[PDB]
Each structure stands twice: as structure tokens, then as C-alpha cells.
Amino acid sequence: GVFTYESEFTSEIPPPRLFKAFVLDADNLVPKIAPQAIKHSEILEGDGGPGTIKKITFGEGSQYGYVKHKIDSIDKENHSYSYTLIEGDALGDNLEKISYETKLVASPSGGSIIKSTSHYHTKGDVEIKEEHVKAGKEKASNLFKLIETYLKGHPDAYN
């Protein structure tokens, strides 16, 4: 199930703080750093860890409805975080599912690289255009920028 989106962006914060924000409190982080379009996030499935199907309401503009995430692994000590995206506008009858896995890496001169790689199981004979991949990385790294400065600039941020 590939098209593949690798996406990377730096903040001025260490990996431990960023991983609380990107993995464990991520439903509280997400509308603080996707506020251009996103509202809330659901235990629709879950007991809060892997299995929790975090389903994410978009704003009153009707452009998306919802998007549905599923945490698939949460491991601070291995320092990566795996989640599926399974339903809503971002599957759009374009897409059958998307695996994500994130790592929050150490930049050689600065803070941490907020990094995700993700694999697009595409629907029927839909193939995803690179011009959507590109804008996709520009949305997705903009939320990784928003939290750059949020995790830094309200740095009690997931304190």
C-alpha cells in the first residue's frame, strides 16, 4: 500500500517534550496546531493507548466532515509512534488506509526533527498525484511548524 509520504520539520525543543505532545497528549496538541481547520479528537474506539480511534472533527466550513486515526503503537523507550488513518475526508474514496509511523530525531545543530513516514494503501485504481503529496507535506509540516513554536513558545507546552 504505497504512495509514501516521508515528512520532516525542526522545532526548538528536545525529543522528550515533543513526544508527549505528538503521541500521548496529541488530541490536546492537535487543535492547538491544526487550528486552521481542526476542532476535536475521539475515543470512538479505545482505552486511550493503541486501539483508540481518534476521530477528529473539522470546522463549520463543511470542507471535510471528519478524519479517523487509530493508534497502533505507543513506545517512548523505542522512541517511535505508529498510528493508522482509516476513515473520513483523507480517505475520500481515493484511499483504502494510511499507515503512519513517527520519530522525533535530534538535529545535529539545533532542537528535534519532528518526522513521520507514511504508506498509502490507495483505493481501486486511484493513484495519488505528487502535487497532492507536496501540498500534503506543506499542510503536515505546517502543523509540525505550529507546534515547533507552540512547544517552544508556550514551553510549559506539554510540561
At residue 111's C-alpha, the angle toward residues 26 and 158, to 5°, is: 30
Return the DSSP state at 32.
H
Strand 80-88 relative to strand 95-106, pairing: antiparallel
Torsion angle of the four alpha carbons 40, 146, 120, 134, in this order, in degrees rounded to the nearest 10: 130
Q: How far is CA 71 from CA 13, 33, 47, 108, in A?
A: 24, 19, 11, 30
* Residue type (1 letter), 35: P
Region at 111 (left for phi over 0; alpha for psi -120 to 50; beta for the rest): beta
* Residue type (1 letter), 31: P
Q: Cα 65 vs. chain centroid, distance in angstroms?
A: 17
Cβ distance 119 to 98 under 8 Å? yes
What is the number of domains present in the chain? 1
Helical H runs in 3-129? 15-19, 26-33
- CB 23: neighbour CB atoms within 10 A? 22
User: How far apart are alpha carbons 16 and 118 in whole angstroms?
Assistant: 22
Query: Grid coordinates standing for 134?
Result: 507536496
User: How far apart are alpha carbons 53 and 70 in whole angstroms?
Assistant: 4
How long is the chain? 159
User: How far apart are alpha carbons 67 and 91 in whole angstroms?
Assistant: 8
* Residue type (1 letter), 98: I
Give the end-to-end CA distance of the chain in Å, rounded to a whole number: 37
DSSP-based three-state secondary structure for 151 = helix
- DSSP tally for the chain: helices H, then strands E: 3, 7
User: How far apart are alpha carbons 2 and 137 in whole angstroms?
Assistant: 16
Helical H runs in the chain? 15-19, 26-33, 130-153
Helices 26-33 and 130-153: crossing angle, nearest 10°? Answer: 110
Exposed, middle or buried, 22 (CB in 10 Å: 0-12/13-18/19+)?
buried
* Residue type (1 letter), 48: G
Query: Grid coordinates standing for 87?
Result: 476513515
**Full residue range of the structural domain in which residue 123 is found:** 1-159
Q: Each residue of 121-157: b (16+ CB within 10 Å) or e? A: ebeeeeebeeeeeeebbeebbebbbbbbebbeeeeeb
Task: Report, in angstroms and rounded to the nearest whole number, the Rg of the chain calculated over CA atoms.
Answer: 15
